[PDB]
Amino acid sequence: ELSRVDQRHRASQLRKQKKEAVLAEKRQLGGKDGPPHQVLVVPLHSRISLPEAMQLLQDGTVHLNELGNTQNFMLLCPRLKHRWFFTSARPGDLHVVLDMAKVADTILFLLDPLEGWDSTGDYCLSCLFAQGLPTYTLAVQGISGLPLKKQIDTRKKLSKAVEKRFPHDKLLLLDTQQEAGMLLRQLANQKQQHLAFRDRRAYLFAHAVDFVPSEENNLVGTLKISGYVRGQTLNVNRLLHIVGYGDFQMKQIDAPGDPFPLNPKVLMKADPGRQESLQAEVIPDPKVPKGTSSYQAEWIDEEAEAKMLEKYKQERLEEMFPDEVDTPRDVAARIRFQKYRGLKSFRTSPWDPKENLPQDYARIFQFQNFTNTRKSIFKEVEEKEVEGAEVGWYVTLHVSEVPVSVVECFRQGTPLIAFSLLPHEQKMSVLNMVVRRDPGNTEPVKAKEELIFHCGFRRFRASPLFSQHTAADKHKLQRFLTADMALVATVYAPITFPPASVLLFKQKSNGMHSLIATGHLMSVDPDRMVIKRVVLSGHPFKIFTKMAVVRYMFFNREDVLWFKPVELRTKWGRRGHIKEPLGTHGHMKCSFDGKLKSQDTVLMNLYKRVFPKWTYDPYVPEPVPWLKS
């Protein structure tokens, strides 16, 4: 650097640059130009009564929004020069908490003084850590209602009890209005955690909803969703996804007056025809005598538990013996394993990615280079500015084709969150999702089981395939979802651009969604080969030097002839191959590298490319509130 004054000048320059960036990022949240600071409030324990906490928290000016069940308000103050919008969730209510935690700028967790959180509080807290955490703040409510000898030990006991989830985070206490102002002052001035999926797209929380049907007999009409835009600039040509109800076209954007400005009708845009994005998920264009033989003619309620224990037995069998299949004695193995082949090396033997494709690939979309397309889309959302509705404006959305049910769900209490998608996000493809299994649930999950996906602001049912998460062009199928490994779940779904959180739930019974697994979305391609392996096993019962006679592995003579070119291996590390079948039954001669033990086992692997099942349906039932079993 040299010349001490010059290096101090360099440091002062760099301080000015970084501080300018900080002052940029701090103006965008709860200000005059910016949108309201959204605070979700979640009471983690069942003893916690939320209403007196939020009555503490409402005191600036309060403008109470109202719904049928959920009661949330608007707080506005010039003492902090800040506009907050508070919402209230109940843990255990999966869709509501997850829906308005993927829009909230700050989560406020409310804690019991005696115990940390409820068991359902742990369930919600697992789902919230897994689907993306915003800025969060801890608060406790009952410390003051104790003698001080108890207060010191209670606060130390909580500080011990929360460190497994919040390791070093200061927990505030909320009993008074002075502490309410102190907590508001804390929530205003914090390092904001940025979630990337919120940042790249144009999301919206619905503050008011109006519906007018085009035909009531059709039960469809245009819907008017009014709120503050939050993400990027909202362009009308792109489609609009309502989180629980699917993605569809929006007609008109207009800007009414901001009803709650911090310090106290016009049509902005109507959608063009050619420049609009089309609603197309799939591909639209589709001399022998009488008695002689041939041998001489050569010369011339409880059933569910039964399937449950069966799945337990199959899981215990497919970890002792990973892919072993007993060959059927009645069906010929060249017919029951007709589509299978043997690979010399699962790493280096070739497989054509386009060899035998089903009729379901003729319905999805593929990418010529997904990395280049994603980089271009992200460059054109950051570096290019579009003349839509800018961030922070109180706007109203006229969407065209939308069913009735949304409206009365909005009257029930369900929040409506709508986000504007990127190009090529309505279209179907094959999503690959890396995922690992929650310690909370230990039910065996088979391969093509129907599960519920939360893949980055969407929510759907589908049947995945589980694969090894490898770097190779082939990836082996897992028949079960293993407890501690990381696996790839592969399924048909509309394309989402990563980064995106992924949650996997199972419909348990009477409407309970059990969180079984969590992870993130990896690159989308239907070129990822998933290979199901079958390992056939036989017993070498006549062992000579470097040659053996093996039985019980096939049962016909030409079964051995069909699977002749496949290399056999051995449980104790030997490697050999088939020479000849000897008996009319499935006895075979096999030559090996070294002498085999009588204790040993011969086995070969067969491979076929397995494809996911088209079972995608966007409708997903609303859960019941969650509880331990």
């Binding site: 591909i283 299978y340 082949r341 043997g342 054509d352 386009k354 060899e355 035998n356 494709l357 089903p358 009729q359 690939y361 003729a362 319905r363 999805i364 979309f365 593929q366 990418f367 010529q368 280079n369 280049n372 397309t373 271009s376 090529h424 493809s429 239907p526 002839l561 069909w562 699977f563 002749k564 070119p565 496949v566 067969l606």
Partner: peptide
């Protein structure tokens, strides 16, 4: 006349392609 290896010569790799989105 066919076995496990030769029969893979009968699989044609040009039929059911998904639609390609160009870059």
């Amino acid at each position: 006349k066919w076995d496990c290896e030769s029969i893979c010569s009968t699989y044609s790799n040009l039929y059911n392609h998904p639609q390609l989105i160009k870059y």
